[PDB]
Amino acid sequence: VLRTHAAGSLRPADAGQTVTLAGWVARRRDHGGVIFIDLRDASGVSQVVFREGDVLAAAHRLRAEFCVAVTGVVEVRPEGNENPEIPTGQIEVNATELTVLGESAPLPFQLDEQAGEEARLKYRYLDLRREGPGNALRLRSKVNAAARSVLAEHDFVEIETPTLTRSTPEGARDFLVPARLQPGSFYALPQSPQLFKQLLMVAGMERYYQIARCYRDEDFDRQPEFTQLDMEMSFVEADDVIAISEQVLKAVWATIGYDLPLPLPRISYEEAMRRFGSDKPDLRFGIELVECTEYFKDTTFRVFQAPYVGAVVMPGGASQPRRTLDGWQEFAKQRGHKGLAYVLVGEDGTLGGPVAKNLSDAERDGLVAHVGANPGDCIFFAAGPAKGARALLGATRIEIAKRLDLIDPNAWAFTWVVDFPMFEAADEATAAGDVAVGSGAWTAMHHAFTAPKPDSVDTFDSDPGNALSDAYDIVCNGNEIGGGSIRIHRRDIQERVFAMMGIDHDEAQEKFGFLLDAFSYGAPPHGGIAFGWDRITALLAGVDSIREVIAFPKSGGGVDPLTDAPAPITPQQRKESGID
Amino acid sequence: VLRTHAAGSLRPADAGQTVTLAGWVARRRDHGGVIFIDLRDASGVSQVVFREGDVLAAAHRLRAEFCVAVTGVVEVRPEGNENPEIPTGQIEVNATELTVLGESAPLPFQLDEQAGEEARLKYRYLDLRREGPGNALRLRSKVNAAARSVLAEHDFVEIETPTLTRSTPEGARDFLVPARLQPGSFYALPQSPQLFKQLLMVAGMERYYQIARCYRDEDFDRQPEFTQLDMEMSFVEADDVIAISEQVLKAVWATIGYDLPLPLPRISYEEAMRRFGSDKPDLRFGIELVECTEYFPYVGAVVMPWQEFAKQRGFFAAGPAKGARALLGATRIEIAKRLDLIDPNAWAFTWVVDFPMFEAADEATAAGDVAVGSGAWTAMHHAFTAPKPDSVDTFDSDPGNALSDAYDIVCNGNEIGGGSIRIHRRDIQERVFAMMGIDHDEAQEKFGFLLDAFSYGAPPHGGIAFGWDRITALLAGVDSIREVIAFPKSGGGVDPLTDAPAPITPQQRKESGID
Ligand SMILES: N[C@@H](CC(=O)O)C(=O)O
Ligand SMILES: N[C@@H](CC(=O)O)C(=O)O
């Protein structure tokens, strides 16, 4: 009998009972001639004491993280050993028998330290004994259940899709698997279940979900395999997918006791880029971008003679020392931008900083009113191509929030971002780490199977820059936590998307024929969404890195300090691989 | 508005209401001047009728498996068009407006035929529209929920384990993944979560489960990837694992309305081989083996209330005990089939316990399996399986007589699960490896992360995994696991749906970091 009672539930009312606990030696301390340990199991901790005889002699072997079974009599602790901070704090187990189920060597790190990432991954099994990490895993399980419960209630069917398949393009490279029985051929682990979930709508399943494993080989806080909550529905429009996504987000945030107000805000891509410099905007604070391109259209200041000029306002920043302002330049350089021009606004409205003297009287006179500044403030400006200037202002805005302590650590600010344009230049995609769908000068903003908005259906291939899509992202605290779209369900439209990314009919049929052929047999309208489940769990847990909510994660570049994967193989094993 | 009401739920009480249905044209027939369809969605079927005007002219385009939205008024059907065989059979929708959401070409097969396996897999998305295959998938989802509900109620934590890892030996070959950033190196897709679930017990998680994906490269009704309900517990003995396994089997069979009596029968390996010729015995019938060794190596008998049969697969069988018993084990089954002795509604379960610890590597290599290493013995269950207490000192030096704390769960002559209490000490585990020819250094290289973990207070632990595809296939009443997998492979890993596996560009191969 290794266990008769859980350690966390003993109380004074249990005095006189004989119990057997099994768990681990959290701490050991010696006072008098006697040995005290805290014995920990999943339900909590009880003090155990070894007072006489052979059990006292045996207790001398005990050290941190020994695994033990102890039988003994529950007792009320003496006056003044009571520990009021723990639920079993009034009692202890006076030990009768002790059995060492497993010894522990001295630890690479004690459980009350946090060690380097490499050590914590290497000894992840010890890390997970610490309260924080272990509760992260317990939470994650609860988060999976909260999602499944809402989905089941709304008649979604859970369906497992293949992982040894053909490639789906989600913007990364594929992980490959050589096929022993077909020398020279490979399976691809899937970047997402996208193609399968679409087929499942053609199959009449109507409402699908999966908590599915996805594989993307990318630049590396990024893991080579990761988890999505993946959903698809038939006969829907975006609102329907949003509405059910909201129910799932509500149930999920309920797991940490936050009541999510519904429905969630929405904002268009254009407007998110305009005001926040980001398609993943952090709305826990203001500090919005203000466009000044038109404002400065007649400037004689070389720097503001540009496609784009924009500003953000730092509350109270005119007081900043010259040192700190030089620091703002470093800030921008460390992100590959020329810098941040600025205007200091005095208490009497007078303008200083280096910019001031380059303005005209008209420009000086209307400026504060134009950017919404106040006496005492600091106006930063970025000028250049619209896309780069906005990202810089988008970053700047965040740094301003940090320095002025404007982000409430308990706040949850969500928004949908909708009305995404349909395409990205392929130049911008290759150099941002992503993989373009093909060799064409355009590629998908979301993915190739994303539908144009009805009004963009005729022109998306002849005027790609203007084309709008029926895609939607869900953002929480400046993180993308999900995205989806209404799909294309016709071959002609889908092939037109592929052709302009340089995939002609024949290649489209070779690489995606099974989907295109399926469109010929009564395909319904459909669409869906996937949530980044690691990211969502990480947020609920209050941690910054998804490594903290994955049981056995990789580090950087796919290094696995726990098992030392990936590893080479024998020449024999390689011959039998059928590779080569 | 594509849909306002489900098609299966209309009834006479809905007469006069305007509804919009969206689904598919199951059937079309024309009589009088009128076009009748059956409109199907997941909830069932309602008849829709097109009687006048523009909607009639448009209904002329409709053919099987067109996908449509139809708005119309619900009506009671005329006397003598009532269809008593379907729940909406008393009513129809008189259509007002019609929209074709997606045309269908002529089908490779109609939904009321069953076609060849290759065609059904090639057009699996059409196959799944047939009642049988689609309900199989709906059931499987329910089966997953029934298992999760019991496990959550008993404080198990669902935990996801890696798939890009190092190899675990479950008796097959590994599927490999080349690592672009480490030229010449590979990940292995996991044969099961075994190593991780043991680490999780060392991590103090105490009760783990996962519905996990497993990858084994074998001979081919066998899929290269498949699903396990995987469980592990700390501070347990076999009975504790069996007890919780039984609760999970009860909740699962309740999904088809069978009340599973508990506890389940148990029988030792020795006795299962003796009486049934099989460690996966079918107990829906008798026809037991009778040993004919003491009617002056092995002679046995079975009684039928045949030569071709024996030849094609390898009264009385005589020879080495293991082969003779398998033949009699097979014979017994053929007897049951020919005399119609198997009640198709019966569920006969049993645990098989007290498994011996090893088998010969000769018997394993020639049965399709892969031995753990170079040694003349290999595991009966897996290398991490504990010897029974009495076998702890001699399993090394008298392997034939060593007994293990493993257990299998069998239903109707299928293994549907298996587990064991594990080893949690390095010396014992290494002694197991050594006799399979894996000495200390190789054991540390290939399994060091587990062995090292045994130095930091490892608890007793054990568990089990169920073959979830096989269990779902049984609940559904089908013989092949292909019928309860959404997009399965056929034979030899052929995938008629997507044509995987496929070759790759020279460019793609260079970037692979392979070569
Ligand atoms: N397949 C998408 C999700 C979606 O479009 O629903 C992804 O991987 O992000
Ligand atoms: N890992 C085993 C199951 C177990 O031993 O629990 C299997 O793959 O069958």
**Contact criterion met (CB < 8 Å) for B137 and A157:** yes
* Positive or negative: CA dihedral A190, A194, A197, A203: negative
Residues of A in contact with B495 (CB under 8 A): 165
Angle CA A87–A89–A93, to nearest 5: 110
Q: State the DSSP string of A175-240.
A: PEEE-TTSTT-EEE--S-SHHHHHHHHHTT--EEEEEEEEE-B------SEEEEEEEEEES--HHH
Q: What residues line ligand 2, using a CB cutoff of 6 Å?
A: B 170, 192, 194, 382, 418-420, 463-465
Strands (E), B385-494: 406-411, 414-421, 461-467
Residues just before a chain gap in chain B (C–N exceeding 2.5 Å) are 220, 296, 305, 314
Q: What is the 3-state secondary structure (H, E, C) of A521-560?
A: ECCCCEEEEEEEHHHHHHHHHCCCCHHHHCCCCCCCCCCC
- Rg, Å, chain A Cα set: 30
CA-based nearest residue to A295, from A314, A310, A276, A285: A310
| Token digits of residue A101 | 């189920």
Residue type, A269: Y
Q: Contact, B484 vs A158, CB < 8 A?
A: no
Nearest CA to ligand 2 atom 8: B192
* Closest ligand 1 atom, residue A527 Cα: 6
CA-based nearest residue to B217, from A546, A469, A8, A182: A182
Domains of chain A: 1-107 (2.40.50.140), 130-267+410-580 (3.30.930.10), 268-409 (3.30.1360.30)
DSSP B460: P
Q: Contact, A64 vs A107, CB < 8 A?
A: yes
DSSP A255: G
Residues of A in contact with B235 (CB under 8 A): 2-3, 22, 69
For A561, nearest residue in chain B (alpha carbons): B449
Which of A161, A167, A170, A435 to mutate for ligand 1's pocket (most ligand atoms within 8 Å of CB)?
A: A170
Residue A80 touches partner B, C-beta closer than 8 Å: no
Total Cβ atoms within 10 A of residue B402: 20
Residue with structure tokens 């050594």? B434
> Could you give the C-alpha distances from B46 to A331, B24, B73, B129, B132, in angstroms and in order?
66, 11, 12, 16, 19
d(C-alpha B211, C-alpha B193), whole Å = 10
Quote the longest CA-to-CA distance of chain B: 92
Q: What is the bridge-based pairing of β-strands B186-188 and B358-360?
A: unpaired
Backbone angles phi, psi at A175, to 5 degrees: -85, 130
DSSP B106: P
Name the H helices within B339-379: 361-365
| Helix (H), strand (E) at residue B85 | none
**Contact criterion met (CB < 8 Å) for A102 and B215:** no
Quote the longest CA-to-CA distance of chain A: 95
Closest Cα in chain A, distance from residue B95 (Å):
19
Burial of A60 (0-12, 13-18, 19+ CB in 10 A): exposed
The structure was resolved to a resolution in Å of: 2.6
Nearest CA to ligand 1 atom 3: A530
3-class DSSP assignment, residue B127: helix
Which of A446, A473, A488 to mutate for ligand 1's pocket (most ligand atoms within 8 Å of CB)?
A: A446
CA dihedral of B433, B439, B440, B443, whole degrees rounded to 10:
-50
| Token digits of residue A580 | 């080569």
Total Cβ atoms within 10 A of residue A213: 21
Selected residues 132-171 of chain B with any CB under 8 Å from a CB in chain A: 134, 137-138, 140-141, 144-145, 148, 152, 157-166
d(C-alpha B55, C-alpha B48), whole Å = 12
A229 Cα to the center of ligand 1, angstroms? 10
Strands (E), B235-329: 266-268, 290-291, 298-301, 316-319
* Positive or negative: CA dihedral B129, B131, B136, B142: positive
d(C-alpha B335, C-alpha A561), whole Å = 56
CA-based nearest residue to B457, from A41, A58, A118: A41
Q: State the DSSP string of A117-136.
A: HHHHHHTHHHHTTSHHHHHH
Rounded to 5, what percent of chain A is helix, strand, coil?
A: 30, 25, 45
Closest Cα in chain A, distance from residue B339 (Å):
39
Selected residues 27-66 of chain B with any CB under 8 Å from a CB in chain A: 40-42, 65-66
Which distant-in-sequence residues (6+ apart) come within 8 Å of A302 by Cβ?
A: none
| Helix (H), strand (E) at residue B234 | strand B225-234
Peptide bond into A263 cis (omega under 30): yes
Q: Contact, B180 vs A172, CB < 8 A?
A: no
Residues of A in contact with B188 (CB under 8 A): 565
d(C-alpha A282, C-alpha A291), whole Å = 19
Q: Contact, A110 vs A73, CB < 8 A?
A: no
Beta bridge partners of B36: B29, B49
| Token digits of residue A53 | 């005889």
